[PDB]
PDB file of C-alpha atoms in Angstrom:
ATOM      1  CA  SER A   1     -71.983 -32.947 -36.514  1.00  0.00           C
ATOM      2  CA  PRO A   2     -70.465 -32.013 -33.402  1.00  0.00           C
ATOM      3  CA  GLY A   3     -68.148 -29.078 -34.044  1.00  0.00           C
ATOM      4  CA  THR A   4     -65.151 -30.379 -31.137  1.00  0.00           C
ATOM      5  CA  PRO A   5     -63.518 -33.280 -33.244  1.00  0.00           C
ATOM      6  CA  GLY A   6     -62.434 -36.461 -32.617  1.00  0.00           C
ATOM      7  CA  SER A   7     -58.965 -35.389 -34.153  1.00  0.00           C
ATOM      8  CA  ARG A   8     -57.915 -33.532 -31.595  1.00  0.00           C
ATOM      9  CA  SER A   9     -56.150 -34.956 -28.406  1.00  0.00           C
ATOM     10  CA  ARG A  10     -58.263 -35.999 -25.132  1.00  0.00           C
ATOM     11  CA  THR A  11     -55.536 -37.270 -22.967  1.00  0.00           C
ATOM     12  CA  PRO A  12     -56.719 -37.878 -19.800  1.00  0.00           C
ATOM     13  CA  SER A  13     -54.843 -36.428 -16.460  1.00  0.00           C
ATOM     14  CA  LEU A  14     -53.099 -38.572 -13.735  1.00  0.00           C
ATOM     15  CA  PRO A  15     -52.177 -37.654 -10.056  1.00  0.00           C
ATOM     16  CA  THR A  16     -49.464 -35.202  -9.827  1.00  0.00           C
ATOM     17  CA  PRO A  17     -47.335 -34.936  -6.678  1.00  0.00           C
ATOM     18  CA  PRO A  18     -47.988 -31.729  -4.320  1.00  0.00           C
ATOM     19  CA  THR A  19     -46.366 -28.733  -4.739  1.00  0.00           C
ATOM     20  CA  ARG A  20     -43.441 -26.767  -3.243  1.00  0.00           C
ATOM     21  CA  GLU A  21     -42.134 -23.449  -3.116  1.00  0.00           C
ATOM     22  CA  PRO A  22     -40.346 -21.867  -5.982  1.00  0.00           C
ATOM     23  CA  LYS A  23     -37.610 -20.437  -3.236  1.00  0.00           C
ATOM     24  CA  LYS A  24     -35.912 -21.606   0.266  1.00  0.00           C
ATOM     25  CA  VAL A  25     -34.813 -18.153   1.662  1.00  0.00           C
ATOM     26  CA  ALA A  26     -33.264 -20.366   4.253  1.00  0.00           C
ATOM     27  CA  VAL A  27     -31.106 -18.262   7.196  1.00  0.00           C
ATOM     28  CA  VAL A  28     -27.790 -16.658   6.798  1.00  0.00           C
ATOM     29  CA  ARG A  29     -24.847 -16.694   8.986  1.00  0.00           C
ATOM     30  CA  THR A  30     -22.196 -13.787   9.064  1.00  0.00           C
ATOM     31  CA  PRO A  31     -18.892 -14.577   6.698  1.00  0.00           C
ATOM     32  CA  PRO A  32     -15.638 -13.966   9.779  1.00  0.00           C
ATOM     33  CA  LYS A  33     -13.036 -11.220  10.256  1.00  0.00           C
ATOM     34  CA  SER A  34      -9.876 -10.382  11.662  1.00  0.00           C
ATOM     35  CA  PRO A  35      -8.160  -6.877  11.963  1.00  0.00           C
ATOM     36  CA  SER A  36      -6.908  -5.276   8.698  1.00  0.00           C
ATOM     37  CA  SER A  37      -2.866  -5.397   9.405  1.00  0.00           C
ATOM     38  CA  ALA A  38      -0.726  -2.309   8.900  1.00  0.00           C
ATOM     39  CA  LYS A  39       1.265  -2.433   5.876  1.00  0.00           C
ATOM     40  CA  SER A  40       3.908   0.786   6.388  1.00  0.00           C
ATOM     41  CA  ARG A  41       5.938  -0.614   9.294  1.00  0.00           C
ATOM     42  CA  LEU A  42       8.234   0.604  11.963  1.00  0.00           C
ATOM     43  CA  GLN A  43      12.046  -0.420  11.030  1.00  0.00           C
ATOM     44  CA  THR A  44      14.929  -1.214  13.430  1.00  0.00           C
ATOM     45  CA  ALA A  45      18.606   0.683  13.546  1.00  0.00           C
ATOM     46  CA  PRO A  46      20.483  -0.919  10.315  1.00  0.00           C
ATOM     47  CA  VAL A  47      23.991   0.591  11.978  1.00  0.00           C
ATOM     48  CA  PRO A  48      25.069   0.127  16.137  1.00  0.00           C
ATOM     49  CA  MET A  49      27.192   2.085  17.861  1.00  0.00           C
TER      50      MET A  49
ATOM     51  CA  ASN B   1      21.213  28.416  11.039  1.00  0.00           C
ATOM     52  CA  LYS B   2      17.569  30.030  10.748  1.00  0.00           C
ATOM     53  CA  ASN B   3      15.871  26.826   9.329  1.00  0.00           C
ATOM     54  CA  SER B   4      17.650  24.179  11.721  1.00  0.00           C
ATOM     55  CA  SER B   5      14.459  22.178  12.774  1.00  0.00           C
ATOM     56  CA  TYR B   6      14.427  21.258   8.982  1.00  0.00           C
ATOM     57  CA  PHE B   7      17.533  19.719   8.563  1.00  0.00           C
ATOM     58  CA  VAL B   8      18.724  16.147   9.789  1.00  0.00           C
ATOM     59  CA  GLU B   9      20.489  16.262  12.436  1.00  0.00           C
ATOM     60  CA  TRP B  10      23.276  13.340  12.283  1.00  0.00           C
ATOM     61  CA  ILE B  11      23.986  14.865   8.620  1.00  0.00           C
ATOM     62  CA  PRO B  12      26.383  17.968  10.030  1.00  0.00           C
ATOM     63  CA  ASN B  13      26.754  20.689   7.430  1.00  0.00           C
ATOM     64  CA  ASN B  14      24.251  19.364   4.286  1.00  0.00           C
ATOM     65  CA  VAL B  15      25.205  21.601   1.331  1.00  0.00           C
ATOM     66  CA  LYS B  16      26.936  21.003  -1.924  1.00  0.00           C
ATOM     67  CA  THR B  17      28.032  24.441  -3.434  1.00  0.00           C
ATOM     68  CA  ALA B  18      28.942  24.703  -7.306  1.00  0.00           C
ATOM     69  CA  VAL B  19      29.003  28.256  -9.123  1.00  0.00           C
ATOM     70  CA  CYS B  20      28.969  28.950 -13.066  1.00  0.00           C
ATOM     71  CA  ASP B  21      31.276  32.278 -13.966  1.00  0.00           C
ATOM     72  CA  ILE B  22      28.272  32.604 -16.928  1.00  0.00           C
ATOM     73  CA  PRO B  23      24.843  33.746 -16.358  1.00  0.00           C
ATOM     74  CA  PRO B  24      22.022  33.070 -17.918  1.00  0.00           C
ATOM     75  CA  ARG B  25      20.528  34.779 -20.863  1.00  0.00           C
ATOM     76  CA  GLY B  26      19.094  37.982 -20.130  1.00  0.00           C
ATOM     77  CA  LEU B  27      19.663  37.658 -16.408  1.00  0.00           C
ATOM     78  CA  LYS B  28      22.442  39.074 -14.187  1.00  0.00           C
ATOM     79  CA  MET B  29      22.811  35.963 -11.373  1.00  0.00           C
ATOM     80  CA  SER B  30      20.126  33.316 -11.001  1.00  0.00           C
ATOM     81  CA  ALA B  31      20.399  29.871  -9.063  1.00  0.00           C
ATOM     82  CA  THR B  32      19.312  26.220  -9.461  1.00  0.00           C
ATOM     83  CA  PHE B  33      18.176  24.350  -6.882  1.00  0.00           C
ATOM     84  CA  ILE B  34      18.336  20.292  -5.511  1.00  0.00           C
ATOM     85  CA  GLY B  35      16.912  19.554  -2.806  1.00  0.00           C
ATOM     86  CA  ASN B  36      16.715  15.882  -0.602  1.00  0.00           C
ATOM     87  CA  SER B  37      14.662  16.079   1.890  1.00  0.00           C
ATOM     88  CA  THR B  38      12.037  13.359   3.994  1.00  0.00           C
ATOM     89  CA  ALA B  39       9.034  15.804   3.777  1.00  0.00           C
ATOM     90  CA  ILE B  40       8.520  13.983  -0.135  1.00  0.00           C
ATOM     91  CA  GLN B  41       6.995  11.033   1.228  1.00  0.00           C
ATOM     92  CA  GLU B  42       3.404  12.759   1.102  1.00  0.00           C
ATOM     93  CA  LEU B  43       3.635  11.497  -2.767  1.00  0.00           C
ATOM     94  CA  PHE B  44       4.563   7.916  -2.018  1.00  0.00           C
ATOM     95  CA  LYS B  45       2.262   8.007   1.087  1.00  0.00           C
ATOM     96  CA  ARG B  46      -1.041   8.783  -1.810  1.00  0.00           C
ATOM     97  CA  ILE B  47       0.065   7.060  -4.272  1.00  0.00           C
ATOM     98  CA  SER B  48      -0.032   4.147  -2.113  1.00  0.00           C
ATOM     99  CA  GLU B  49      -3.222   4.573  -0.678  1.00  0.00           C
ATOM    100  CA  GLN B  50      -4.742   5.407  -3.513  1.00  0.00           C
ATOM    101  CA  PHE B  51      -3.307   2.366  -5.310  1.00  0.00           C
ATOM    102  CA  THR B  52      -5.455   0.314  -2.290  1.00  0.00           C
ATOM    103  CA  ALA B  53      -8.488   2.093  -3.701  1.00  0.00           C
ATOM    104  CA  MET B  54      -8.108   0.532  -6.881  1.00  0.00           C
ATOM    105  CA  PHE B  55      -6.661  -2.539  -6.146  1.00  0.00           C
ATOM    106  CA  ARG B  56      -8.323  -3.737  -3.356  1.00  0.00           C
ATOM    107  CA  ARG B  57     -11.475  -3.386  -5.868  1.00  0.00           C
ATOM    108  CA  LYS B  58      -9.329  -4.929  -8.545  1.00  0.00           C
ATOM    109  CA  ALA B  59     -10.446  -1.907 -10.584  1.00  0.00           C
ATOM    110  CA  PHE B  60      -8.953  -1.738 -14.364  1.00  0.00           C
ATOM    111  CA  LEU B  61      -6.610  -4.663 -13.885  1.00  0.00           C
ATOM    112  CA  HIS B  62      -7.483  -6.561 -16.603  1.00  0.00           C
ATOM    113  CA  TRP B  63      -5.639  -3.973 -18.552  1.00  0.00           C
ATOM    114  CA  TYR B  64      -2.483  -4.883 -17.485  1.00  0.00           C
ATOM    115  CA  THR B  65      -3.757  -8.835 -17.656  1.00  0.00           C
ATOM    116  CA  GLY B  66      -4.276  -8.370 -21.345  1.00  0.00           C
ATOM    117  CA  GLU B  67      -0.676  -7.555 -21.506  1.00  0.00           C
ATOM    118  CA  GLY B  68       0.423 -10.664 -19.893  1.00  0.00           C
ATOM    119  CA  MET B  69       1.510  -8.488 -16.162  1.00  0.00           C
ATOM    120  CA  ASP B  70       0.374 -10.679 -12.983  1.00  0.00           C
ATOM    121  CA  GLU B  71      -1.432  -9.713 -10.068  1.00  0.00           C
ATOM    122  CA  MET B  72       2.419 -10.905  -8.510  1.00  0.00           C
ATOM    123  CA  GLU B  73       3.789  -7.888 -10.218  1.00  0.00           C
ATOM    124  CA  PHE B  74       1.420  -5.851  -8.631  1.00  0.00           C
ATOM    125  CA  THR B  75       2.056  -7.544  -5.117  1.00  0.00           C
ATOM    126  CA  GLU B  76       5.822  -6.967  -5.115  1.00  0.00           C
ATOM    127  CA  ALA B  77       5.943  -3.128  -6.187  1.00  0.00           C
ATOM    128  CA  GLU B  78       3.326  -2.365  -3.676  1.00  0.00           C
ATOM    129  CA  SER B  79       5.644  -3.813  -1.370  1.00  0.00           C
ATOM    130  CA  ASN B  80       8.718  -2.145  -2.498  1.00  0.00           C
ATOM    131  CA  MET B  81       6.678   0.866  -2.099  1.00  0.00           C
ATOM    132  CA  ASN B  82       5.529   0.471   1.234  1.00  0.00           C
ATOM    133  CA  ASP B  83       9.095  -0.333   2.020  1.00  0.00           C
ATOM    134  CA  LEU B  84      10.053   3.092   0.403  1.00  0.00           C
ATOM    135  CA  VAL B  85       8.070   4.371   2.463  1.00  0.00           C
ATOM    136  CA  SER B  86       8.485   3.306   5.429  1.00  0.00           C
ATOM    137  CA  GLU B  87      12.630   3.984   5.836  1.00  0.00           C
ATOM    138  CA  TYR B  88      11.157   7.752   4.921  1.00  0.00           C
ATOM    139  CA  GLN B  89       9.866   7.043   8.337  1.00  0.00           C
ATOM    140  CA  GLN B  90      12.999   5.666   9.657  1.00  0.00           C
ATOM    141  CA  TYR B  91      14.934   9.254   8.480  1.00  0.00           C
ATOM    142  CA  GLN B  92      12.169  10.993   9.455  1.00  0.00           C
ATOM    143  CA  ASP B  93      12.337  11.940  12.998  1.00  0.00           C
ATOM    144  CA  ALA B  94      15.625  10.108  12.763  1.00  0.00           C
ATOM    145  CA  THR B  95      17.573  10.556  16.284  1.00  0.00           C
ATOM    146  CA  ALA B  96      20.895  12.590  15.931  1.00  0.00           C
ATOM    147  CA  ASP B  97      21.732  10.549  19.905  1.00  0.00           C
ATOM    148  CA  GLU B  98      24.118   7.938  20.250  1.00  0.00           C
ATOM    149  CA  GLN B  99      22.865   4.186  20.989  1.00  0.00           C
ATOM    150  CA  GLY B 100      24.143   1.619  23.529  1.00  0.00           C
ATOM    151  CA  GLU B 101      23.483  -2.536  23.237  1.00  0.00           C
ATOM    152  CA  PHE B 102      23.543  -4.840  26.573  1.00  0.00           C
ATOM    153  CA  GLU B 103      23.146  -8.438  27.214  1.00  0.00           C
ATOM    154  CA  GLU B 104      23.053 -11.366  29.942  1.00  0.00           C
ATOM    155  CA  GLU B 105      24.097 -14.588  30.434  1.00  0.00           C
ATOM    156  CA  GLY B 106      22.904 -17.904  32.012  1.00  0.00           C
ATOM    157  CA  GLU B 107      20.310 -19.026  34.323  1.00  0.00           C
ATOM    158  CA  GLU B 108      18.431 -18.247  37.823  1.00  0.00           C
ATOM    159  CA  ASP B 109      17.868 -21.082  40.065  1.00  0.00           C
ATOM    160  CA  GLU B 110      14.295 -20.363  39.835  1.00  0.00           C
ATOM    161  CA  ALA B 111      11.699 -18.949  36.714  1.00  0.00           C
TER     162      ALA B 111
END
């Protein structure tokens, strides 16, 4: 007997489309900034002359 | 007189005297002091920039969120404190010199 039987899957292969890469790695842009504000402040005179 | 660089120049005579007749027990004489100076802002300056290190990280903040306290209570308590330290600056180096004020009314024929 043939030692690899017919009981076994013989599914024939297909036209699979071409392979895309795993990762894009497109270029980044820096995020924007404005400068930090002082939190403790200068104050005016509460009392006049 | 001899520490006069270290007194607020617009509160002439900064002192309160009180004297009990009875000493402390087993000393002959003693005194206890109570002083209000602007120099204490190193406390409040330290606490508020230290806070910045934690809170601009949001570090530990979950243990206040876990008891239903929110960032707006943080934000208001920090904004009291910077306001407190700013008023120390306002009374630090505070001028004992008088003020004056002046203002004008109308318009020129060109601007």
